[PDB]
């Protein structure tokens, strides 16, 4: 505990990146929105995953709740999934601290290449979702920030569903979506992701989902989100259905 | 009726291409497994695509047969929609005449760049998808047989699903598909389609899907298959559902 | 003239462009480092196109340097070509006011999604190059800043080279450019340009060169380079070849 | 030295299967072009050796230096040393091995295709030798199907002389429109070593080798193929500059 953690990630990732590797995951990060950080890039150590992964799973056996809806704001794609909301995450002392560590904020930024702020709305600083049945997805949408840090603390294999796919280079227009329109006139990146794994996601400019599980498993993830300069901007749309499951553009079915 | 529609359907395509534009045409194919004709680009005579239209929702009305299940030889990928079977298309004189018609196929040679061989099984030579309930799909799959030319009798508007999703220069392995894994190695292209489009497909190396309803819509689509001289063979899988909805590959 | 210049593109740009239209480009560029302004997106009105190509014609005439070197900085990729220093652009009170007018940069602003910043060396605010010769080029490199309008004021025909080259999302590493490697990784998009065509490029994070003259033709760029917020650094490498054709970087 | 192929059976199988080969077959289709590198050897080292040493003394022998533009690829140039397939065929090395069943057998799992080695007496086999600054063999299409090229001596990257290619086109000699496809489609640029083999679809990749930034040595071998498109056709464009220097395409 205490200042021990930024010390050790500090020396965790100076055995592993240089300014030469992390300009290159930049190039990646600005193409693809995207950029993995698996066995081969890995971001923190296994025993501080497993502590964010052992306050995950004791926050969804305290606070899932079911949500099964559509998102009005991004063209009905839906929400099947549980989720534990922002305020009750943000008390976990370990993952509050960390998403502000100085450390991997200026690791990340360097990737970014931009200053990365943790500054958001108090009701979307950390998401956990939690899909556990067939035909649980995260439908496409953008995200109202930048950025964001996805844990991909538990992973279904691959024949199961649950990759994210991935359009960078767009835009989110609630008023007119235009997801299928999108798709018509992009390419999907498709990603897998493993058990352990993490990814940096520019959320407000890449049209990303969830492959739907095609049977029941298990997808557990957390959502680290922060803003760029960009972001300090009104929030518009009530759409924050994670927050709110009866908000206006949640819809039935 | 008759060999005047192979007449009047030369002089269809005499009027709208050339050899150098079916060249850049087949580069398409090449490239996207996929060409399509739409508006900018007609294949056959409104007049002609109405009489194979009301041929299908007659059949629809006659012979459709409900299928919901998964394909073990293509990842356990769904099959939401109803169908009708060859041997009730093949009945149709219009519509078996134009499949051999040596005007279509001619024409559709120079896409393909090779010859266009309608000797295949004959429970495959056609087939009617009708496609009307929310989360209705054609899972992702590739074809027995290189070409499938698909009329797009009837499509919802995109915002609604139904597009033609599409990974080309892939293969089909029934024993280990690899569907999910291939689309993590490949962009994915999708294709709008709208009601009265055709496309041209190379359905054995194009990995192929419809995206699903994302609501009660009407999606209706004939297909047309043929081989080239790579598929004059034997048929594998036990997995032709469409014919048969106890085939051995398929599960609820 | 003078203030009527910004009073007349704002009304301009009114008619030609809306919100949702110019994320659209925002988009194109973010994806590609680039975007053209072509018959098709025009950005000035004719008048100011032809007043600022009268007096590019001028400034050639009157400072026209010769520049064959190679650029260490940029693995030695040629600058084959002919030039007018910034010092001697920035004179033009047309080119001046231009370039830090309120409603162009304004309007670009919308495509970048960051605010341009007319805050650069004073060596590198503008830039004209004349290539006329065969082999004439301007190799592959990058900028030192973030944004660049080029004026694409004469262009000869493709078939004789002078298409833009590029490969959006790189960086400049001036100890290890990496130029043939980086492209044996990643696709080539080449840009056709036309007279009178503009283009907004991303130089920073963009590697590209102009086609080599196939044969001696007349290929003739204005310069308008800007500063992003990440820009207001320390110059480094001594490669400033367009203002000092003796630079320390550059092999005559 | 003898009958190399129950050698060269042993070494490939070894290191592919069926389902390996399946995936160098995707890759063929999509891109053109397939590279046998350290990863996935193609020859002994034994063999590559013999190879190679059969070349080099072709080289001292029957080089002729090529300068010119084709007329039929846009008046791309071929600057280089070549040497004749008739020179070449006199190798008993390399006429054996370019019709060996073993080689053509098992490339026919890339190609998915029969690989006929009936074609022109003049076209059968190439080597060409390119040393100086700008030595190039321009944008250009090959009149049969295949070709597998032997990259016997590369430099390195920095010095060029890496393969361009931009799959699914086709050469119209009468248009043939490089300049334009090339701004329309993205450029896949290709790095090779010295030992590196590749397989390239010649007739519908638009290809050519990025010339020498400065003096340097780049030697490969061309084993030239037919598809069963390629049967008995009409050699047709007077641009055979490899053979007859002086060919009625060929610009000084
Ligand atoms: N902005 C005008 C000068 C730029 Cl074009 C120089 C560039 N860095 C190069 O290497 O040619
Ligand atoms: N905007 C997202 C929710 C993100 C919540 C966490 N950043 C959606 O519509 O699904
Ligand atoms: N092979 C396809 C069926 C094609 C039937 C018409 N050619 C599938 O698995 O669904
Ligand atoms: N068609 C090629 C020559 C290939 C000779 C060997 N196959 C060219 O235009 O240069
Ligand atoms: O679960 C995931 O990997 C994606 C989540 C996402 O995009 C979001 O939280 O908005
Ligand atoms: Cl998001
Ligand atoms: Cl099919
Ligand atoms: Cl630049
Ligand atoms: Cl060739
Ligand atoms: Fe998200
Ligand atoms: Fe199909
Ligand atoms: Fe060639």
Known sequence: NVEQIDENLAKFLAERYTPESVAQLADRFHRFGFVKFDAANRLVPD???????????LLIEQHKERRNLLLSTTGNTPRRMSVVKSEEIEK???????????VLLGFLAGITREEIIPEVSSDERYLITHQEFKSDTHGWHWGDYSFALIWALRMPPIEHGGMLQAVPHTHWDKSNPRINQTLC??????HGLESGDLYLLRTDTTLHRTVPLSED???????????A???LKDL??????????EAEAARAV
């Open 47 to 57: 025993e501080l995953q497993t502590a964010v992964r052992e306050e995950c799973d």
């Open 217 to 227: 498993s298990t997808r557990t993830i957390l959502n680290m989100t922060w803003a």
């Open 236 to 245: 518009v749309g009530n759409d924050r259905w994670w927050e709110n499951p």
């Open 185 to 190: 006139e992009r390419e999907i990146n498709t």
């Open 229 to 231: 300069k960009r972001d």
């Open 92 to 102: 976990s002392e370990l993952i509050s601290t960390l998403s502000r560590s100085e």
